[PDB]
Design a protein around this nucleic acid. Structure first.
Lengths: 135, 212, 98, 59, 134, 72
DNA sequence: ATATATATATATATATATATATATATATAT
DNA sequence: ATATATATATATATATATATATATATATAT
DNA sequence: TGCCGTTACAATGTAACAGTGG
DNA sequence: CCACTGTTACATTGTAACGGCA
């Protein structure tokens, strides 16, 4: 663990995730019966201002499918929340045309390094040419 | 969704209009009755849903207004859907006297309970006796018959004010009454420290007071 | 707190947020402001929410005598009124018994 | 009256203390982090400025 | 106009977008009074399965300030929907560390090229340098 | 709460004028097309609303509507 | 000076909900 | 093979809330 | 100008790999 | 082993700003 886990924040994150999934129409509950599922969802809604009880509601009515997605999404959210503090740790999203991305990904898999590292190497070779031109 | 109260009416407005106190209170208000702190149930009901009821009555082109003293009432506008009426000049005189008695410490022994005789005595003390009688009858010159007539007119105006909530007769006695803060409206022309002729214009513009 | 470290301050803020979640559930707009105060990219939001809380407690002052609008100041007046009402309550209970 | 005044006073106290504990903590954390970052930054500034003249005259 | 517009598709897109915005709390309607807003939202909700009437609903009750955002969202949706048919017209989304992105954007702004064009040029120059050395 | 259709009837922009005219004792016949149609549609709820006032909303055999006050 | 309208209180009967006690059929211990 | 306990249905009658009619006081207007 | 394609982001959600310690 | 965490590489949708064109 590199990032401090805060209980009263991650609990709210989890509750918001459950509510978003439900309102999107997915079956967060493990219940096939309509009545029990509706009651469990209503109780989760009541749990809005008590994120602490959300862990118990998860252990009581959460669909067994969603544990992996849960542990993935909140983990990623924690990383992003702690990285957003400083610019130099942030990430920037860009879109690439299929040919360009294909060539770049092939090159990266060839060199066995991540996309950012490959871009660093390319721009660094270009900047080396520029530097030797400058000297 | 449909079949949902928020489509047509706010939830709190619907709750207020569905309250057991709403119909009698509404009838009294439209009748012209002012509401004071004494009517604990009705006053609290108005306080809780003051904005909802105000917006409801706005549909009639009449303002549900709470004076700074804390008593609610209705002021119709020129385009009122509920008719409007003005108090008689004698009613204004008696209301001013009642406000004076409310503020007068000399009558502290009365503890708020007053008889029509005391009201008439104060009225003649502060007003012009014969010239006030002039309105009672155009041909009065101090005749005791016109004196009794003026007493009866004051009694009738007192009853009318009781109907408006400005005064309460005692649970068993109709010859004694207790004043209410609503009477303060009779002094709305002097609560502000400005020229009387300007405050009067302000009031008449606001709809508070037409002239005679 | 100037002696504390980053983790301790973060945990203390987490606990305070947990408390505010319950203390704010009734209110709508102040609750929304609290929720927006969670962004790490815009720390100033925190202070804004703080101001909102004061801007709330300012309007919760009851009567003219309690118009020490600074909420930290009206606490003493409220406690004084509580003591006065306590003695008054004792007197009233005595009266009712007789 | 006692009930209402006590409820209002407790609400005031709780809200005030919780809000202060919520905000001042991150405020002081920000202050300390800013001071530490400045202290670190000065060293890089000085070393970069020295290397600047060094390589300006080396060529 | 490059992409042909289909009514029964874009109207469903608009209905879904408006429902999403309403569920998110955005004020869909121009009515400040809550009753009229709720009535209009209910009309929209029960208006599902209708292009010719969702268009009229937008014309009649749509919030004035959301028109531009909805228009550009539908523009992007149309372009992406038509481009997603073939592999070569699709777009690949990646995340770049802030320093790397800063340098790449510096180059792109300096040379007037886009990120795709800049990366193409950089790879081509790397290949040319390889051939020079080799 | 309140009946939903009663809330719909109360909210209708015709309700204030019609309510004032009813409480004034006016009789609403077939001539008043809008008012008569409103009363036709919402009688089942306006009868209860005006029974809360110890008054009866009566539709005469001829058809016209009116308010009959009780003793209370 | 007195007819008349209006508000309030009481008595009286209607209609409905509900708790009580008894009668009847079945279940289960003796 | 029996008698007591249970569940069911029923009538009894108890109480409340409503609506009506009558009496009263009394405040207005000719 | 207003529509229409296009780019460069932001925010969030997921799958897959790499680390780390119990 | 096993689980939990950090990170990368996408997708998905929305939005603002340019620039082309009737």
């Amino acid at each position: 663990m590199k990032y401090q886990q805060l209980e009263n924040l991650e609990c709210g994150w989890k509750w918001a995730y459950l509510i978003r999934k439900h309102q999107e129409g997915e079956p967060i509950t493990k219940y096939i019966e309509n009545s029990a599922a509706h009651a469990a969802v209503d109780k989760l809604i009541k749990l809005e201002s008590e994120p602490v009880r959300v862990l118990e509601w998860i252990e009581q009515h959460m669909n067994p499918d969603l544990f992996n997605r849960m542990k993935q999404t909140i983990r990623a959210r924690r990383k992003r929340h702690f990285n957003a503090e400083h610019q130099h740790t942030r990430k920037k999203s860009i879109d690439l045309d299929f040919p360009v991305w294909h060539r770049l990904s092939a090159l990266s898999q060839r060199r066995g390094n991540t996309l950012s590292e490959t871009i660093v190497q390319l721009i660094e070779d270009a900047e080396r040419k520029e530097k030797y031109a400058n000297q | 969704s449909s079949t949902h109260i928020e489509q047509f009416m706010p939830v709190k407005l619907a709750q207020a209009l569905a309250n057991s106190l709403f119909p009698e209170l509404d009838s009294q208000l439209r009748a012209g009755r002012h509401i004071g702190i004494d009517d604990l149930d009705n006053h609290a009901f108005l306080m809780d849903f003051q904005e909802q009821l105000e917006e409801f009555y706005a549909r009639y082109n009449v303002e549900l207004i709470r004076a700074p003293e804390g008593f609610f009432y209705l002021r119709p506008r020129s385009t009122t859907l509920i008719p409007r009426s003005v108090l008689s000049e004698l009613d204004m005189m008696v209301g001013k006297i009642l406000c004076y008695l409310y503020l007068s410490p000399e009558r502290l022994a009365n503890q708020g309970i007053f008889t029509s005789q005391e009201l008439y005595e104060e009225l003649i003390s502060l007003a012009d006796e014969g010239k006030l009688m002039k309105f009672v009858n155009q041909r009065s010159s101090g005749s005791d018959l016109d004196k009794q007539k003026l007493q009866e007119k004051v009694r009738t105006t007192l009853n009318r004010l009781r109907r408006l909530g400005m005064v309460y007769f005692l649970p068993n006695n109709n010859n004694k009454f207790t004043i209410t803060e609503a009477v303060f409206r009779f002094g709305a022309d002097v609560r502000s420290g400005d020229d009387p002729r300007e405050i009067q214009l302000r009031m008449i513009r606001d709809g508070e007071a037409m002239p005679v | 707190l100037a002696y504390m470290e980053g983790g301790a301050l973060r945990s203390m803020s987490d606990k305070a947020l947990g408390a505010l979640r319950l203390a704010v559930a009734d209110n709508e707009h102040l609750r929304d402001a609290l929720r927006l105060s969670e962004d790490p990219k815009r720390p100033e939001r925190k202070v804004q929410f703080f101001i909102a809380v004061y801007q709330h407690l300012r309007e919760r002052i009851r009567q003219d005598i309690i118009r020490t609008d600074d909420p930290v100041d009206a606490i003493e007046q409220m406690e004084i009124e509580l003591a006065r009402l306590t003695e008054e309550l004792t007197a009233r209970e005595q009266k009712l018994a007789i | 009256a006692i009930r209402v005044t006590q409820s209002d006073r407790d609400l005031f106290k709780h809200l005030i203390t919780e809000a202060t504990s919520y905000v001042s903590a991150d405020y002081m954390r920000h202050a300390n982090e800013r001071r530490t970052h400045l202290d670190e930054a000065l060293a890089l500034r000085g070393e970069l400025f020295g290397s600047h003249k060094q390589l300006a005259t080396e060529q």
